[PDB]
């Protein structure tokens, strides 16, 4: 929006806000990331530690699908069950719902948070952390593995 640009407020002020002494020259410090080690050294070290150098192993032709592993925490597991199925869970304590996280696009079950009180759940997943399994078991549930 041109009418809000501050250059308009500076019309008639000679230097357009860039000063009489310093002026606005083309590239008085080099272009782009020039001088990262010489005259912009302080800037890089102060704000971008680790910028220069090499670390770790290369991986030629690394495909990300091999590493696909979405995770879901314990505290979020109950939210996957439909509301109508939640009522059934509290209506019969003999059985427990079977939550197959893979059907909801999750592979591994992590163990952040707690489960609903007095509600056993059977969790079906590809992978699971030890804390997640412990919390499921101590709540009266069980873990089933799939692929």
């Amino acid at each position: 929006t041109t009418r809000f640009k501050k250059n308009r407020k500076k019309r008639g002020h000679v230097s357009a806000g860039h000063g009489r002494i310093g002026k606005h020259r083309k590239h008085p410090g080099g272009r782009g990331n020039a001088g990262g080690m010489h005259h912009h050294r302080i800037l890089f070290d102060k704000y971008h530690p680790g910028y220069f150098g090499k670390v770790g192993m290369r991986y030629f032709h690394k495909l990300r699908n091999k590493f696909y592993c979405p995770t879901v925490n314990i505290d979020t597991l109950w939210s996957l069950v439909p509301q109508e199925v939640k009522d059934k869970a509290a209506a019969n304590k003999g059985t427990a719902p079977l939550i197959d996280v893979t059907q909801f696009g999750y592979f591994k079950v992590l163990g952040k948070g707690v489960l609903p009180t007095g509600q056993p759940v059977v969790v079906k997943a590809k992978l699971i952390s030890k804390n997640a399994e412990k919390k499921i078991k101590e709540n009266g549930g069980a873990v089933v593995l799939t692929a």
């Binding site: 592979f107 590809k126 992978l127 593995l145 799939t146 692929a147």
Partner: protein
């Protein structure tokens, strides 16, 4: 190549599925020729003979320099896989030649 265990890790991992043998294809016999082609190639070998480097290989196999024969074959043909196949071919030619 056992059926998958149904687990996502370990040996034979993967989704449980009933595996079946792939249906036979005409391309399965790729690399095999008819009896006539073998007959033609055998006849042309008699008419054409052997190349100079093949003669060098068989001469080394006569003096028992098997290791040096293979090195000559690899330098000429280029690959170890082809070199050792070529050496066996020369040995077969020599093996049934000394028996005649």
């Amino acid at each position: 190549k056992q059926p998958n265990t149904g687990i996502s890790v370990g040996l034979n991992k993967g989704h449980v599925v009933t595996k079946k043998e792939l249906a036979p294809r005409p391309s399965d016999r790729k690399g095999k020729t008819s009896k006539r082609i073998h007959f033609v190639r055998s006849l042309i070998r008699e008419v054409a003979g052997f190349a100079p480097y093949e003669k060098r290989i068989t001469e080394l196999l006569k003096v028992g320099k098997d290791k040096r024969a293979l090195k000559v074959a690899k330098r000429k043909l280029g690959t170890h896989k082809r070199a050792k196949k070529k050496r066996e071919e020369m040995s077969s030619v020599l093996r049934k030649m000394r028996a005649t």
